[PDB]
Amino acid sequence: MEAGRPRPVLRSVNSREPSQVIFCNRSPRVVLPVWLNFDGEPQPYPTLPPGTGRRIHSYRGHLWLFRDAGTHDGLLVNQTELFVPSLNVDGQPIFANITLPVYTLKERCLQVVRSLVKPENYRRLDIVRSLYEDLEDHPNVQKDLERLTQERIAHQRMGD
């Protein structure tokens, strides 16, 4: 390899080592799984119903995130933002549990309102002005990636 970290921070590494994973949709939403390729570009996959689970052939070190298929609101996997497969053991397959996060009241309300009103008419609503901008800022995977990247750098620190 080359010294330094090539590529974008949030990206899967092509580790040749396979990992068997089963995605379990523990939430009420239709979940759209997203795989971040080596490039760090999000790739969509077939959606899953709220009752369902599915088998996946991933690799150790691959990155996955999950969102509401329709809304693109954030979802949690194993109580976290990102899921990365690790080597399976006697453990058998590694589970990725998709669960609804407990959304802040404000965010939940934003979600409900967004579903109800067309974006053209956000401004028409008689609500506080500041909320208008918030409403427009719908959930976005790319934004999330940027946020995660920054958080990740913070995560990195010198060792003991």
């Binding site: 404000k106 965010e107 008689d126 609500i127 909320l131 918030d134």
Partner: peptide, 12 residues
């Protein structure tokens, strides 16, 4: 729906 804008600011 009426309350939604105000509930969202108050929540925020």
């Amino acid at each position: 729906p009426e309350i939604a804008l105000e509930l969202l600011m108050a929540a925020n």
